[PDB]
């Protein structure tokens, strides 16, 4: 079988403070990213649905709120669901991270 991370798993991940700490996986959650081709010719495949001012159809014209607070016109390409992990640290703080920010233990 392929290795997997599951709820309750003791692992090592990055705290919001940037440092690594042992933590526990509280639950698996799916994050959905949107991909769009901007009118200016560039494209982003890591926007969140909250950045559009179900998902639109490929080619559909949409307005995207960028990181600069400005709105740009674009056409929707596709949505990308990605398996992610909600982990909780010693102080009780919690975070949703990707596979690459998680280091598993042998037991």
């Amino acid at each position: 079988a392929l290795q997997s991370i599951t709820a309750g798993q003791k692992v090592i991940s990055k705290h919001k403070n940037g440092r690594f700490y042992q933590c526990e996986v509280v639950r698996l959650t799916t994050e959905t990213f949107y991909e769009v081709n901007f009118d200016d010719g560039s494209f982003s495949d890591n926007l969140y649905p909250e950045d559009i001012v179900g998902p639109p159809a490929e080619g559909e014209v949409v307005q995207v709120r960028w990181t600069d607070g400005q709105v740009y016109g674009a056409k929707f390409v596709a949505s990308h669901p990605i398996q992610m992990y909600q982990v909780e640290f010693e102080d009780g703080s919690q975070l949703v991270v990707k596979r690459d920010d998680v280091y598993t233990l042998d037991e």
Binding site: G41, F43, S44, W66
Partner: peptide
């Protein structure tokens, strides 16, 4: 991640 590019 909100990153853009022309590829």
């Amino acid at each position: 991640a909100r990153t853009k590019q022309t590829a």
